Design a protein around this ligand. Structure first.
Ligand SMILES: [Ca+2]
Ligand SMILES: [Ca+2]
Ligand SMILES: [Ca+2]
Ligand SMILES: [Ca+2]
Ligand SMILES: [Ca+2]
Ligand SMILES: [Ca+2]
Ligand SMILES: [Ca+2]
Lengths: 166, 162, 162, 162, 162, 165, 162, 164, 162, 163, 163, 161
């Protein structure tokens, strides 16, 4: 199994729709690697169109909680909940491969109330990670747009562009 | 296997719809762990929207019965039965991650009795009065990690680990 | 594998709807454990809402035949055929967990035969009258953990592990 | 896999529909068991609603060919081909568990010829007459565990272990 | 598993309907047994109702090609292509079990062409006349174990191991 | 696994209808056998009714590229893409089991691109069978089976595998 | 597993539809081989009708990013994304087997943006003008192996292991 | 249409499972006959296992509401809502065919579910002549009445032997 | 519509599986034929394997209640309920066409009650005993049109409009 | 055709799920009856568990538009939109039969609040209830017997028997 | 047939998903009523969530072509293609029932942008708004109430009661 | 029925896929109208994305065959076969509605048939056989006037006057 062998090189993959089980499988992997060695870096390859907020947040909170710095490489695309986790990687360790696309955007009374709290919480965290203002993120997260690798770096969404192994 | 390897540090996951067989899987692990070492603590991660009530109660009863303290870290969400089992954790060893979400939610003779019995246990674990639980479960309640501590659903929040 | 590794502490799980496939998988585990050590007690966890009468009766008959006592622990629920098998465990070793719940009910002529025998068989196991069984199974009587001990359907409630 | 370990106890299962592929797996095991030890009895557990005759006849004729006496133990039910395979067990070693059902019931000229061939073998294994079997099998024949011993389909009720 | 050990006794099964993928698995087995010991015989049990003329004739030509004799033993039924491949076995080493049926039974340009080829090979193996082979191909014909010996499909019936 | 054992005897099996995945597997085994011993022959048994062109054409091109001679033994049937790959075997090492059944007239895959491919097939087949283009084109379009000895005559295969020695 | 074995030779396969997970499997294989020996060439056999742009642009970006040159052979066919990744291989080291097919054919504002970037890369690797690619990708353009070499999609035909 | 013709004989059929659309027809038919002659009796031929309660009550109330007395005639069976609407027939005009049989059974949600259950017993008892509590435990047990029994249960009046 | 003007000739057809909604159509036809003229005989042609009991029973009771006699005619087949309904006609006006199959066959307390009832109603109409009606329904019985007249099932055969 | 004949006495039936094509049929009937007689009352019998809001609101507005008063009668049940169209009848001409069940409960976030809010106003406007009573009743389900319905102000009066 | 009797009062219904065959049925009745009397008004009731372009465009072009002025009335909802046809009615004669609901969210990118630009041109044209405005407002998600439809100029006026 | 009543106005409709059975109904109509009055014209409203060739050609040949002039009118769209028939109407009387879309785009025996239709299409549109062989290869969308300049259609119907 390749995925197991690449785990020995502390590399984890995030592929496809984010839902409970693949998230739990990522959280499992992160906690495992930390256990093996809490000092070295985890490498998370993100290629996801997005998915369930509740699922993706478990992955986020694991990245922050564990002592290892998690490094997020975006290959292919990082849209919405994907983008969110890509930008949530250890500071100075977030990358795009050159041709990858990042994108942002995602009874009655009691539930509308809750999505609005959640939405505000996302924006607050995402501004904090990209270095943008809370206000700027609000405008841009409504804008159903795609950033290129360079633009994601200009936007503070990732740090630099992976281009060639040195 | 990553999950079986994670069982060598006494960590069990409860993920997704709480259903009869995934419930059984959890009970099998807890028993197994207890058998390896009935002293050391178990850590049960909970990311579930809820599920079948009899299936949930089997998870519950095993946690109380088995000798080890079962710690309950909630990640993502613990709604309905998820919340129940989260609050079911060893007193002092129940945690939310920061951006976790928790929710209070959910033959007539039997179901009315079943509900009442939950409401009681619910109060017991949170430390809120029967009446307090009784109003919130009826009318869908959401709780963030700080609120989850406030309510008594969990003890503290996990943020980082040094 | 966690079910197999529990099997070598003589633990067996009966879960979900009873039916031939799951049934003669339990019957195969019992015969297995007997062969290893015909003296040591087998432990059978029961969380089923009932099932196929054939399938269940195969487990009933297997529990009796084998030398080892089959202690039966109810968790979550034990409805009709599941209640039958719970009660059909080793007299003296029929446990409940506190928040479980037991419950009973269920060529036409010869269906009434099978009905009659079940009634008889459960009276033999509970300690009750064939009249009371015939009364309480006509209407679907729900039983709490303590109420189950009162009815002789189970022996004592497992609460904590000493 | 529990079942292949029980093959070390010379136990072979016969569950579910009697069709060609499963029937072959029975044969293969019996033929394998003979290889290991030609003297020691084989134990064919039979919980089957019956199926294809030809599939059943492979199992039947293999039983008679190998050296080991094949002891048929019935459980749950043994209908049509199931019954037939059960009654086909070694004379003196055909058993039943207390609550097991047993049943006997069921391109043209050959149909009436296979029918008769079955009846002859039925009567020759039960101790009955092919006059008696013909008249008696024709419909809805649910012989209970005792009825089956006093029809001569099996030899005794297995209740408990030696 | 079971089949890969019966292969250490040079024993192969032809189970169910004949088609390319099962046929190909059998040709792999025969080739393998030849590779291990070209001298010792192979043993091919057949319970087939028939199948693809293509798939069968690949089994046929491997049997005829590989050094070892392929003794055919029949159980249950050998209909059409199975009947064919039962007769295709080594002269002298073709066997029936007592209650095993056989059935000799089965763009014109070629279908007739290959038909004649079957009938010719059929008569070459059974020692029958090409017209009686034609009578039984065209109009269906069943043969019980002893009839198959008399008709010439197989050499003898197997009764017991000795 | 029986098929993995027979790989130590450098025997690959082309069973059923030819498509990308089964074909990739066959290619994978050819390259693998070449890896382990590039001189010793490889034995492709074919029982196939045909299939996709590009699936088969990777099996074909692999056969021609690798150092080993790929003997094709045919059993059961080789129809269309089956027949093609049968005839594609190393020369002098292409066989028929006596009651095998070779056949030609429709492979499997914008009309002028199809006619170009169809022409390429007919050419390669002609080259392998030693026939003219003329003939291949006439007879492919004709709906009839070939027996083992007829495929020998036509130059599809070289001889009949008969009995082992 | 045969694909494991060829990975010791640094051979990877890209068969069928280009899709997020199968693609992750290729990225994963390429990284593994990089780890093992960053100098020695990787060989990527392609037989695909194309697929998803994100899936393929992860295989593309890696091919460029990892140290070793990813030589690419095309067998059978490489259509749309297949062709693109085929022409993305190391300069000097892109091949077609003799009888293969290469083929180049294809919110909505960003769809045109992606298509443009795509065409620009296609031109860069083929040594062709952007506007030429823009016509060939639009009107479905088939290419024989010699036509793929002339077009500059691949470098040479790969006829025999010289 | 055969049913159309039998309608100007003032005959309507309640057949199969009781649900909104067929019940809506039965009500439309009864509303229609009232329009014709408000005094002449309607004859409702019942033959049904039962169905939805909301559906059944739309029939029941249209029977009680319209001027005409609705005569009822069980044929084959009248189970559950079939048993209910059969006994709802105009006092003194409820019938069974000799070999026809009758049978009677079938959180804030619970509150209302028990209300209905309570009401249906009160209407049953009221129409059957039995006490409210007689009906109560006699629906929990599933009850299979013969035609003569249906009269002894006070559910129907008499049996139908032949025409006059 | 054929059946409309053929109902002007007072002919009804009972064809197929006798269910509620087709039974209701027959009842309507009868009541309708009565209001037209309550003394001329209605003619019911039965070609049915039978079906639901409650359906057939309403058809039965109507025939009796309505004044005009319901002369039955068996064409094709009258089996189970169709067979029953056939014998239900006016004693003196029940017919079988020369070539017609009549066969006799067919909440447990009630099934045994209603099965009893069927029998005695069949018995009273036929002139047979309760014993013989019970005897012939358990296993098969195919009465030919002559045998049916002999059985007291119908009155006489209709060979010709003479 | 029974329903056509009943239409001659200005009787129209609302039955089952409220959706486009069944509602469109009801509006076509209501417009027809206006075209025949602009003055005389129309009687809409209701037996519906609810359905699509858009569909119900085309019934709602047709009832208010056409000159004829549309008298609503309730048979069986009137839940969600059912209860809404039931209250929409002519002030004074809204009935339940004695055993009519009436249920009051709720069937692009803030969008729906705006629709929800408007419905409540109409409800409180037809029932004479407080806006907050309609708000509270339609956030937890609410059951009404025929008498309860009358004192809620949902319908006007019960229909016992004929005249 | 209630719709056929309604047709004899020059009333047509456009209900549900707009697709080729039901749109043909509408185009059929329009030509028919033009043949019946070319000078007198036709009335189209719209309760559609939208649907296919080509199908919706045949109705549109038929409306503009026939000599009768087509009066559009919105009952229930008119979203996207429905709203497009709603606003396409003869100027003056376009209506919304009070609680009706109008929406204008987006109904080969080479061609699909050409079609989109055309749609917005025609929309702006029929509304009296700028192309630039219609371009921005169709961009994202909001329903319009009957009055908001009148102010934006989708529709000319709310139908009150039968005057 | 609406369509029988419009049939009095010698109006026929082509809607949806052009398969065998709908095509028959159209040929059955066109024949009926000719029987009713052979001089007076037939107005065929096309709104179709194309379909079966044998079906389309039965409509096409009936049109040419019968004495009434068949004025084709496009509404919505006329793609491939739909287009084919649109431009197969009586010359002079082939129309588009303002917002119509025409499209033209679709073994040894196939290439024959392809030519045969390219010939008739070229013969009906005016422009050369080769010019058509190019434009049917490309995913073509002609608007109303674009269609006119191409000669698929003769003018745009704007208003009844
Ligand atoms: Ca590189
Ligand atoms: Ca070059
Ligand atoms: Ca208020
Ligand atoms: Ca209030
Ligand atoms: Ca105009
Ligand atoms: Ca005007
Ligand atoms: Ca705006």
């Amino acid at each position: 199994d390749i995925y197991s062998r690449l785990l020995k090189e502390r590399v984890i993959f995030l592929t496809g729709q984010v839902e409970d089980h693949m998230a739990n499988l990522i959280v499992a992997q992160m906690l495992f690697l930390e256990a093996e060695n809490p000092e070295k870096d985890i490498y998370l390859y993100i290629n996801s169109p997005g998915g369930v907020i509740t699922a993706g947040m478990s992955i986020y909170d694991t990245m922050q909680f564990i002592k290892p710095d998690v490094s997020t490489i975006c290959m292919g695309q990082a849209a919405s909940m994907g983008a969110f986790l890509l930008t949530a990687g250890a500071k100075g360790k977030r990358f795009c491969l050159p041709n990858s696309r990042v994108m942002i955007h995602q009874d009655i009374e009691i539930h509308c109330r809750e999505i609005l709290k959640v939405k505000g919480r996302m924006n607050e965290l995402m501004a904090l990670h990209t270095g943008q203002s809370l206000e700027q993120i609000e405008r841009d997260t409504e804008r159903d747009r795609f950033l290129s690798a360079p633009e994601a770096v200009e936007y503070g969404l990732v740090d630099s562009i992976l281009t060639h192994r040195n």
